[PDB]
Amino acid sequence: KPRNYQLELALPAMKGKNTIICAPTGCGKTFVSLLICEHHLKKFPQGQKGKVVFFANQIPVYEQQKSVFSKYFERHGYRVTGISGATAENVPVEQIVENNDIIILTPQILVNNLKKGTIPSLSIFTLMIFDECHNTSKQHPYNMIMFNYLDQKLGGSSGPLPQVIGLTASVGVGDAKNTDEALDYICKLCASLDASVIATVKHNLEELEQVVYKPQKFFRKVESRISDKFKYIIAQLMRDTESLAKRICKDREFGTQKYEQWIVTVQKACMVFQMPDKDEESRICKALFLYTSHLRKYNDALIISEHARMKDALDYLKDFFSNVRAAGFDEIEQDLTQRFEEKLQELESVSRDPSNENPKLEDLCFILQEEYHLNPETITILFVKTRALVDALKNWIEGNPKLSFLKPGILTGRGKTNQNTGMTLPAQKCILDAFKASGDHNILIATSVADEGIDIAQCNLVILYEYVGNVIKMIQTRGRGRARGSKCFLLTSNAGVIEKEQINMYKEKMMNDSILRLQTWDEAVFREKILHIQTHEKFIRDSQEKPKPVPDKENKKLLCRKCKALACYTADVRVIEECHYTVLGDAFKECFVSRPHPKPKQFSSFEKRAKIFCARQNCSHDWGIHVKYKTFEIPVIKIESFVVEDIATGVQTLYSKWKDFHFEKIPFDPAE
Amino acid sequence: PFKPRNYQLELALPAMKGKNTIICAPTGCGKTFVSLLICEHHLKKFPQGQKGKVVFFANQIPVYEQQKSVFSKYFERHGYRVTGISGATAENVPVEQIVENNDIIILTPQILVNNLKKGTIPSLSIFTLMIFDECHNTSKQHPYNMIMFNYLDQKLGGSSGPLPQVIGLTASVGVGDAKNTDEALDYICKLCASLDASVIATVKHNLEELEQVVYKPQKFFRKVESRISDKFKYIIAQLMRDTESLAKRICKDLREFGTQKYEQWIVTVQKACMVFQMPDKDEESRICKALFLYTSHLRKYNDALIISEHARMKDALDYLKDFFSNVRAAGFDEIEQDLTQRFEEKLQELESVSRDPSNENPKLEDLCFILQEEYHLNPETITILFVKTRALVDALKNWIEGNPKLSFLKPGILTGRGKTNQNTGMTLPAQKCILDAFKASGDHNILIATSVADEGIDIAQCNLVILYEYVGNVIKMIQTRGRGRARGSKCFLLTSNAGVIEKEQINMYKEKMMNDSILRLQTWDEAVFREKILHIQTHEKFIRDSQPKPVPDKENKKLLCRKCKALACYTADVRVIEECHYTVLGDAFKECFVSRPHPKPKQFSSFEKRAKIFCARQNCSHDWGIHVKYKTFEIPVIKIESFVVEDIATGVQTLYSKWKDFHFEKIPFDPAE
Amino acid sequence: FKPRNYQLELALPAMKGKNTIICAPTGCGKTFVSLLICEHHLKKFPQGQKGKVVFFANQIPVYEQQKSVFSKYFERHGYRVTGISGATAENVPVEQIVENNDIIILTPQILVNNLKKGTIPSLSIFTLMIFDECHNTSKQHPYNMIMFNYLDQKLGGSSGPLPQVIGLTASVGVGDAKNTDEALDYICKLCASLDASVIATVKHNLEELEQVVYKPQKFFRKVESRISDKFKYIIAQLMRDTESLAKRICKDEFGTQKYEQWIVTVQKACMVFQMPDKDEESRICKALFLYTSHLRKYNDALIISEHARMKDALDYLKDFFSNVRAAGFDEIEQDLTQRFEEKLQELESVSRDPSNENPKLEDLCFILQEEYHLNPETITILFVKTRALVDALKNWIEGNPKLSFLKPGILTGRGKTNQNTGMTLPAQKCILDAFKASGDHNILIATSVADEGIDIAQCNLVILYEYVGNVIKMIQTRGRGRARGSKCFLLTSNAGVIEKEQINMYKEKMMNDSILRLQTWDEAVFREKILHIQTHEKFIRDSQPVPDKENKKLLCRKCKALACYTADVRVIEECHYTVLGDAFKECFVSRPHPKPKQFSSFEKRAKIFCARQNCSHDWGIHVKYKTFEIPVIKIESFVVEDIATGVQTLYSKWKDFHFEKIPFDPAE
RNA sequence: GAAUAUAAUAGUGAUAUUAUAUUC
Ligand SMILES: [Mg+2]
Ligand SMILES: [Zn+2]
Ligand SMILES: [Zn+2]
Ligand SMILES: [Zn+2]
């Protein structure tokens, strides 16, 4: 049955007003959605019918809402359907939309179908419901859909538009430093969604506050490790490496992001290093590549060491040199691997010493010990920045004798689609189903979760380990511990993290006050302001087009970034669906080898079968993948794996995305 | 009359069942009514041929008067005589008969301590119920702890006869310097042992109600930077170095300016210059006086630097201007004239630097930003602003009144009573007058204050609290929340020192430990807890039973003025009144001092303050003590802190802070002489 | 607080040590005057000596208010402030309490009782006595008794020092004086009763006083009575139906006070009717009692109907016949109730028509409408004579749609101590604290307040609905509307009321004139005249029966049943009367007391009633006295009968019953 | 239970009746 504050939140929407509904995470948004949809569909007369679309930007939420909606609206004469990438191709989208009254949808589907024209107008819908509507900004699919919406609204405008509902726990305030800037941001968000009302709980605050409780937050400022002999050894290793790199080619503190941002630039600048003798250029470029890569890995190791155990860093390095040893053994790689193996002894000697322990981990252990001593039934979630740090802390917990009461579990993202990393959806679902009080896992170590997501087991202890986020995620993560007495511990040694979190707190205050102020305005006047903002933003958006770079028709050569080997020419390149890039000719097929794809999935009219690597003298550089497009079995490459050196001027240039590499892109033809 | 909220009955329940109890609940939840419930039930529980006698302990006169009034109006109907005894009504009255002929007695704990000590009240068995307001003060050498020492001594000792039930009232028991759960539990258990408490009562079954009555304000942390360019500091520092050189050029002598380190140093140096020896001894007077003047001016300059660092340069410069204004109109002095003119030299440059808007304190700017924002969002905002010193109070009032951007503010002042023998602070009827004007429809919009002892009387609710460079304990942290019980109240901690923020965070974690420890203790069996606190009591008593006097000195000494080293009197002339106060005999001493009418004439003990006495030699005007009417005698009373002790024989000069540390042949005052 | 100049002026004679009567308008702040006088008085004494003040308040609210104010004020100066009232008077050492305190707030009756006892042997223990509302110092009032002690010590050979005497009032009164001479006589006699030699009034600061206390403008409203008389017709022949019924049992201008007096006399005459057959005497006497009671109730209903709605009277009778039932079945009660129930229809038909309205209620409604239309923020106070009229006008206001803007509250006395009527003190405090501008109530219906009392919310509109009073009450009521623009409306249908209020105004003139004339006299001469009046009054006061030892029977006044014999009666504390033996225990039933109070050494537990065949006539109460649980009876509930002669006599008070009164003894 | 005051109505008045309020 409906809680009164849910009816309160749904009321403005039930009156047909475009509404941004803002309420605490876990107060029950699903049911509000159900109310709004029900009322909306039942309001039409006989000769007319309604059609609702529900946007969820995550597959688990998509499936959940699809399930609940179909189970709920079955009794009523309303057909519910769902569409995602898993079921998107060779299906008549327009028919599915037309033959159903409720459509749960990944926004990208609607974007693609709007662009391709299969869905000519949003007038087909009478109600659009954006889950996590705060994402309606910039180049997000939500904002694309609303760009279509507003383009229709401010344009010829002769077709009718659907009602718009947004759901969120925080509208955000941007980089606002005062209430008026925050108010401006909020008004612009309302404009992006064409919203005239922001709905919040006011008359039922008691009811809401005996369902959702705000966890008590604590700040923990510890200090760095005063002694780091580990860093003293690794530093010498790194400067030996860059000394070798300096020796081969004659043209910032270690363990920092600055050194990483530097070494990435250096590696990017060594790739374009050119010589008349191509062999020597190849040798030197590959050598510098390996050098910069090793340096990067050493830096990563230092970072891991400062954020966790020395053993975790040393194991990271061990697995890296394992990586390298397995992937062909080169003489310079032999030199570097050696160069790690003399110091390996001293490193393991330093790491085994209890003297050199991270105080951050000691404080974390102190918190865990205290809380679980007070309550052995404690359910904990532990957020960190990187997956390496996830595994690191898992090993630390499983290793620490004083934490034997903990049963650690892991929760990371899917990782990159073309890399054997991350974690599949069924694995996540498995560990999450295992993560209960009656389950196997006691504490869940995780990186980060996009928005609210599916409700998991309630955690009476949240720990933010060197964790930085915005105000939105700050408000959202409260949903992890809704039970009264829940605690959140921000643990760090950066001081700036603390200030950041406090700034986010003040930003929450600004947001709430701005909402309160905005709600006192007259709706008509606010609609006028909204329209003005929409016209303003549309003008700025249309003015920002600037399309003009003339496609270079002079044929260029693509050289492997690692070994500078000639992959192919731009003349051989064909573009499929204006997005993907393949190569024709039997010549190119002998320039690469293939290995079975780690994460095979049928994206678009493609079917990943394998990853392709450089074949030239053990290079094994990632060039792209191999797919089964329609009737053809063809390779697909990425420009960030090559170097554009054109025949004439002979100057090498780097591109990260094909959208920036302007040349005579020839469309793909089956008759070729 | 009213009607008890459920959680109030829940809090009162262990007490009504006769258990010794510490009631711990948020500030403003309504403790007076809980007290009334407990007292009413307690008194009405006795049969016909018996009667109860309740004593209530408030350690503040306002709370004393409040509780006296409330209990009087409440229990008069039920036929229970209510009375009270404060320091103002404790002398020349039969305390024993007053306690005997009343059912409820509101009391300042010191009255009971002194009357137990004298024997006018032979035992606590006369009471059947003792209530300690702000019971967390029951520790160390606090009067509460003295009373409970008497109580416990009667308990454990062969002493018997019935002991009264003991109730304590607080919002926070504290955890002391605990670092974890076990230490916090140790501390809390030791407090329960101090109060002989077997039960800690909190709200559990009616949390929703309480939360609908008392809301926790949202706390924000504001870290800002200090001013970076400070010419004021440079000029003042140069003045300080000049004064130091002047001090060195007169006497052979042997940290940074604007710190507590410099303050400790200059105090040490002043005290050291006081024991400077010369054979001439009339040049000793000149040199010592000069050094005293120099060190005093240096101290004032340092204070100026600090005020400047926490406020406007104008505030510091006005502080100095007021200081030299006090130096003037006191009398002419070559040294004082020299220093004054040395200040008047740099005065122009100082004023020009002080008027430049490019040197505004960013802390005051952020404060102004906060006030502006919150009053823009709600012009009916009632604000309370806590600062460290009274100088900063005055400074911030002046700043607010002098700031056009804060024209919507109507600042009021709230400070302590100040030292009893100085014309500073603020009188109680003044605090009352200002607090009564501190309303939404009153004359004042924002209240600038130093600090408050515990909770105190309920003033107007503030939806905005601002801690300006403020550092307190977990108890005061929890207590100050009562200033904003309403939903939506906000508290801003504004500082430029990260240690402050960190300290408040530590306090929050300490609150967590306190709550968790209490929750843990509440699960224990009552008998086990009784046993544990009994063992703690027995141990602490065993320690206290033998935790040693020293021998006096019969050799006659001299008391010289610390400023001018002039002979005031000999220790042979000194008599001791009531083992605490010290007077001088002989008509010789009468020619050594001048006097002015006392700024705060109050009757302490058997004395009545009439005047303050000062050194008379060559307009020294150094504070020696006071002049009072004790019994029938009009006599002076002096503090040892004003003099230096020079032994006749050895010639050694020594300093003593308290008379209790000055071990000499203390002759008792005798009216027969 | 900083003193206003007229307060310093009024206080000045007292601070000079003069026995003074301070007379100034209500609301000018007499509390701070008292504080000034007390502060100066206590602080004037040298070191080796000390002063002691006693403050007299005749009301518990004033008592507690003054106790609190004096406590808060004088605590810091070093003076212990205490108080004693009836609630805290028993089993406490009064002498020690007085001795160990500097300022004692007191209900005068406590001092009277302790003076009579001997615990306080003399008034010499006090150095200053202050009488709040000193105009009460007359006749057999507690103030006057205290002053009888005072003056008996003064004029007597007692050389002991007497305390300075201060009185506080807004009107000294003039009695029934017809001219300035008699007024001056009376005022001089009051000054003699208080031993005052000075009357302090504002003179040099009248302009200051008149800007703090404004005199409200009075208006006189003479309206017409009920021209209609149908309701009265019905109830009238109902009354001679009942009168014929009563006349058909034994031998021998409705809606008036004379008829009420007469029917009371008739009931009290029927109570002594005797016969050979005592049972038929019982039946007949009970009959006559019931009939007379019904007649009385009908009369009361008529009065209510003339001063209010017919519906109010009909509801009064309805409530009456509602309480006649649930008390028990009586043949005659059933008869009468039937005789009423048959005409109920016509009565309500008459009470429903809108052509039936009291012109007085319409005029009051017009006044309220005009005043609240001119000012909706109006705070009205409406005085009536009876609580029945209070409830009646409350119902009339809440019923009338034209008075929708009104939020009527109630303010009555505490009623008789042994009845389920009136209103408790905390209830009074509740409604009063609700009666504010921004409160729950706009208009407050009330009967009468003892003197000035505690300051309530300022009423810019005061209405006297058929309400006469003396000059003192007239002057005091002005305190209800001190703000400029305050109005008073004397609404009535009698020329008597208006004429007596005008007479009161003239009496105020006489009073002020007499005072101003007295203030010109030499103080020595005035003291001589005062001493003269005091000596005369003492001579008169020190002016000049055998108890019938024959046993008597106490019969129930209603059913003539035997309660007890006078031989069984014992007297406690020379005032109360109890019964011994197990026999009397079979004669009465009891109900738990509606107002359990702890007066004296007694604690009220229950009311007691006649038990024989559901007579239920109030005989008295049942109390806890020390260790014993005993009945206490009132003689006005019984008919006395002599054993030998058989005479039947009535007594309204025990002190008028001169029989052999045996002192109660625990050893029996 | 008792005491007290005010007002109205009877009586020349002492006083009495009712109403109202207060107190122990
Ligand atoms: Mg009547
Ligand atoms: Zn390659
Ligand atoms: Zn001196
Ligand atoms: Zn009877």
Short mmCIF file of C-alpha atoms in Angstrom, two decimals, chain B residues 372-614:
data_model
loop_
_atom_site.label_atom_id
_atom_site.label_comp_id
_atom_site.label_asym_id
_atom_site.label_seq_id
_atom_site.Cartn_x
_atom_site.Cartn_y
_atom_site.Cartn_z
CA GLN B 372 24.43 36.92 4.23
CA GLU B 373 23.41 33.63 2.62
CA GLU B 374 21.44 32.31 5.59
CA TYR B 375 19.62 35.59 6.22
CA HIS B 376 18.89 35.98 2.51
CA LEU B 377 17.31 32.52 2.57
CA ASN B 378 15.50 33.40 5.81
CA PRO B 379 15.42 36.99 7.16
CA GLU B 380 13.77 35.77 10.38
CA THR B 381 16.91 33.79 11.22
CA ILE B 382 17.98 33.85 14.87
CA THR B 383 21.74 33.39 15.14
CA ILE B 384 24.14 32.58 17.97
CA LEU B 385 27.87 33.15 17.42
CA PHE B 386 30.44 31.63 19.78
CA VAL B 387 33.95 33.07 20.07
CA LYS B 388 36.92 32.45 22.36
CA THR B 389 37.56 35.76 24.13
CA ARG B 390 35.53 38.75 25.33
CA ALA B 391 37.77 41.03 23.28
CA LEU B 392 36.68 39.05 20.23
CA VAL B 393 33.06 39.41 21.35
CA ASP B 394 33.34 43.19 21.45
CA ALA B 395 35.35 43.17 18.23
CA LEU B 396 32.76 41.15 16.33
CA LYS B 397 29.90 43.29 17.63
CA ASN B 398 31.75 46.40 16.47
CA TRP B 399 32.47 44.74 13.13
CA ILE B 400 28.86 43.69 12.55
CA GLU B 401 27.53 47.13 13.51
CA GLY B 402 30.18 48.72 11.31
CA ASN B 403 29.55 46.47 8.32
CA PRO B 404 26.99 47.80 5.79
CA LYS B 405 26.58 44.32 4.30
CA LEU B 406 25.30 43.06 7.66
CA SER B 407 22.82 45.87 8.33
CA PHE B 408 20.06 43.31 8.92
CA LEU B 409 21.81 42.14 12.10
CA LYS B 410 20.99 43.43 15.58
CA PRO B 411 23.91 42.11 17.67
CA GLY B 412 23.68 41.45 21.40
CA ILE B 413 26.38 40.46 23.88
CA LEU B 414 26.61 37.44 26.18
CA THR B 415 29.71 36.97 28.33
CA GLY B 416 30.53 35.59 31.77
CA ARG B 417 30.39 37.55 35.01
CA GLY B 418 34.13 38.14 34.70
CA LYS B 419 36.67 38.02 37.51
CA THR B 420 35.12 38.92 40.86
CA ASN B 421 37.64 41.67 41.62
CA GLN B 422 37.72 43.45 38.25
CA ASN B 423 35.44 45.80 36.32
CA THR B 424 35.00 43.40 33.39
CA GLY B 425 32.52 40.85 32.06
CA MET B 426 28.79 41.35 32.52
CA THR B 427 26.42 41.35 35.51
CA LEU B 428 23.67 38.73 35.82
CA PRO B 429 20.76 41.18 35.45
CA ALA B 430 22.50 42.46 32.31
CA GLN B 431 22.67 38.95 30.84
CA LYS B 432 19.01 38.53 31.77
CA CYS B 433 18.09 41.86 30.16
CA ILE B 434 19.93 40.99 26.94
CA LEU B 435 18.61 37.41 26.78
CA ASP B 436 15.05 38.69 27.21
CA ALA B 437 15.63 40.98 24.23
CA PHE B 438 16.99 38.05 22.23
CA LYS B 439 13.83 37.00 20.38
CA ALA B 440 12.23 36.89 16.93
CA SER B 441 10.15 39.93 17.85
CA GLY B 442 12.83 41.33 20.15
CA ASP B 443 15.55 43.94 19.79
CA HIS B 444 18.29 41.47 18.93
CA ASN B 445 18.77 39.27 15.87
CA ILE B 446 22.12 37.65 16.63
CA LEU B 447 23.83 36.88 19.95
CA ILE B 448 27.63 37.03 20.25
CA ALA B 449 28.85 34.88 23.14
CA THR B 450 31.97 33.41 24.73
CA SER B 451 30.79 30.19 26.37
CA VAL B 452 28.15 28.77 28.70
CA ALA B 453 28.50 26.43 31.68
CA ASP B 454 26.78 23.24 30.51
CA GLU B 455 23.24 23.71 29.18
CA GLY B 456 21.96 26.58 31.31
CA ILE B 457 18.59 28.29 30.96
CA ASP B 458 16.66 27.78 27.72
CA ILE B 459 17.11 30.88 25.57
CA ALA B 460 15.43 31.64 22.25
CA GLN B 461 15.93 28.90 19.67
CA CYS B 462 18.57 29.50 17.01
CA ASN B 463 18.28 28.01 13.54
CA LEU B 464 21.86 29.18 13.04
CA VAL B 465 24.82 28.44 15.31
CA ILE B 466 28.33 29.58 14.36
CA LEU B 467 31.45 28.33 16.13
CA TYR B 468 34.13 30.91 15.32
CA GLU B 469 37.54 29.32 15.95
CA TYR B 470 35.86 27.32 18.70
CA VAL B 471 37.19 24.23 20.46
CA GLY B 472 35.28 22.24 23.07
CA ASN B 473 34.75 18.74 24.42
CA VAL B 474 32.18 16.13 23.39
CA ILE B 475 29.91 17.18 26.27
CA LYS B 476 29.75 20.84 25.23
CA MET B 477 29.40 19.71 21.61
CA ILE B 478 26.31 17.66 22.43
CA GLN B 479 24.94 20.36 24.75
CA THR B 480 25.21 23.21 22.23
CA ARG B 481 22.89 21.27 19.90
CA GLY B 482 20.08 22.37 22.21
CA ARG B 483 20.46 25.87 20.77
CA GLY B 484 18.89 24.52 17.58
CA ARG B 485 16.36 21.82 18.44
CA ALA B 486 14.06 22.85 15.59
CA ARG B 487 14.06 20.99 12.27
CA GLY B 488 16.45 22.59 9.80
CA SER B 489 18.82 24.18 12.30
CA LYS B 490 22.41 24.52 11.10
CA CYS B 491 25.80 24.77 12.81
CA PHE B 492 28.86 26.20 11.04
CA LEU B 493 32.35 25.57 12.42
CA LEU B 494 34.49 28.34 10.91
CA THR B 495 38.27 28.14 11.30
CA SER B 496 41.66 28.55 9.65
CA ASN B 497 43.24 25.83 11.79
CA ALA B 498 42.79 22.23 10.64
CA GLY B 499 43.38 21.06 14.21
CA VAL B 500 40.02 22.56 15.19
CA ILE B 501 38.14 20.63 12.50
CA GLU B 502 40.03 17.46 13.42
CA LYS B 503 39.24 18.05 17.10
CA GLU B 504 35.52 18.30 16.36
CA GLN B 505 35.73 15.12 14.27
CA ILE B 506 37.44 13.43 17.22
CA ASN B 507 34.59 14.69 19.41
CA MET B 508 32.07 13.11 17.04
CA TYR B 509 33.85 9.75 17.20
CA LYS B 510 33.95 10.13 20.99
CA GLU B 511 30.19 10.62 20.97
CA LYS B 512 29.93 7.41 18.95
CA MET B 513 32.04 5.59 21.54
CA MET B 514 29.92 7.05 24.34
CA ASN B 515 26.65 5.88 22.79
CA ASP B 516 27.97 2.42 21.91
CA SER B 517 29.44 1.97 25.39
CA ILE B 518 26.16 3.00 27.03
CA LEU B 519 24.24 0.59 24.78
CA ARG B 520 26.66 -2.17 25.80
CA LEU B 521 26.38 -1.42 29.54
CA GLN B 522 22.58 -1.40 29.33
CA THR B 523 22.67 -5.08 28.32
CA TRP B 524 24.56 -6.12 31.46
CA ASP B 525 22.88 -7.66 34.49
CA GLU B 526 22.16 -4.96 37.08
CA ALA B 527 23.70 -6.95 39.95
CA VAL B 528 26.93 -7.51 38.03
CA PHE B 529 27.16 -3.78 37.32
CA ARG B 530 26.44 -3.01 40.99
CA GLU B 531 29.28 -5.35 41.93
CA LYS B 532 31.67 -3.76 39.44
CA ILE B 533 30.93 -0.19 40.51
CA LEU B 534 31.17 -1.35 44.13
CA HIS B 535 34.68 -2.63 43.46
CA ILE B 536 35.58 0.60 41.65
CA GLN B 537 34.25 2.60 44.61
CA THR B 538 36.17 0.49 47.11
CA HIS B 539 39.38 0.82 45.09
CA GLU B 540 39.08 4.58 44.59
CA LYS B 541 38.29 4.94 48.29
CA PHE B 542 41.32 2.87 49.27
CA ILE B 543 43.40 5.21 47.12
CA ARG B 544 41.77 8.37 48.51
CA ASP B 545 42.14 7.28 52.15
CA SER B 546 45.90 7.82 51.93
CA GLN B 547 46.78 9.88 48.86
CA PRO B 548 50.86 14.37 53.98
CA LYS B 549 51.48 17.89 55.31
CA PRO B 550 54.74 19.92 55.15
CA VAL B 551 56.47 21.95 57.89
CA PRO B 552 56.07 25.76 58.13
CA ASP B 553 58.77 28.44 58.39
CA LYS B 554 59.00 30.54 61.55
CA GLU B 555 61.56 32.93 60.05
CA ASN B 556 60.06 36.37 59.39
CA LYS B 557 59.65 37.42 55.76
CA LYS B 558 58.94 40.61 53.81
CA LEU B 559 56.11 41.17 51.34
CA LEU B 560 57.21 43.54 48.58
CA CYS B 561 55.05 44.97 45.79
CA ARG B 562 55.72 42.92 42.65
CA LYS B 563 55.70 46.09 40.56
CA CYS B 564 57.85 48.54 42.53
CA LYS B 565 59.43 46.24 45.15
CA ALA B 566 58.16 48.49 47.95
CA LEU B 567 57.69 47.12 51.47
CA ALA B 568 54.03 46.35 52.15
CA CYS B 569 54.23 44.36 55.39
CA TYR B 570 55.97 41.53 57.22
CA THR B 571 54.55 38.01 57.54
CA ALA B 572 54.65 38.60 61.30
CA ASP B 573 51.95 41.23 60.78
CA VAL B 574 49.75 38.84 58.79
CA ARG B 575 46.80 36.98 60.31
CA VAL B 576 44.75 34.13 58.82
CA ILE B 577 40.95 34.18 58.68
CA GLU B 578 39.00 30.93 58.23
CA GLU B 579 42.06 29.08 56.89
CA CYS B 580 41.62 30.78 53.50
CA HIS B 581 41.83 34.56 53.79
CA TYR B 582 44.75 36.71 54.91
CA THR B 583 44.72 40.13 56.57
CA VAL B 584 47.35 42.59 57.81
CA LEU B 585 47.63 44.23 61.24
CA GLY B 586 49.39 47.37 62.44
CA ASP B 587 48.95 51.01 61.45
CA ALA B 588 52.12 50.80 59.35
CA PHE B 589 50.38 48.94 56.52
CA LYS B 590 47.61 51.55 56.45
CA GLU B 591 50.06 54.07 54.98
CA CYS B 592 51.21 51.67 52.25
CA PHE B 593 48.01 51.49 50.21
CA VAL B 594 45.41 53.63 48.49
CA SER B 595 41.94 52.36 47.59
CA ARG B 596 39.00 52.72 45.21
CA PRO B 597 35.38 51.60 45.71
CA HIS B 598 34.88 47.98 44.63
CA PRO B 599 33.30 47.51 41.17
CA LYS B 600 31.44 44.40 42.34
CA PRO B 601 30.44 44.68 46.03
CA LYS B 602 29.28 41.16 46.92
CA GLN B 603 29.11 39.32 50.24
CA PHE B 604 31.22 36.17 50.13
CA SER B 605 31.29 34.07 53.31
CA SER B 606 31.39 36.33 56.37
CA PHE B 607 32.93 39.16 54.34
CA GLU B 608 31.54 42.15 52.44
CA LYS B 609 33.51 43.78 49.64
CA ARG B 610 33.87 47.54 50.08
CA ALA B 611 36.93 48.49 48.04
CA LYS B 612 40.01 47.40 46.11
CA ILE B 613 43.38 48.39 47.55
CA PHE B 614 46.41 49.43 45.48
#
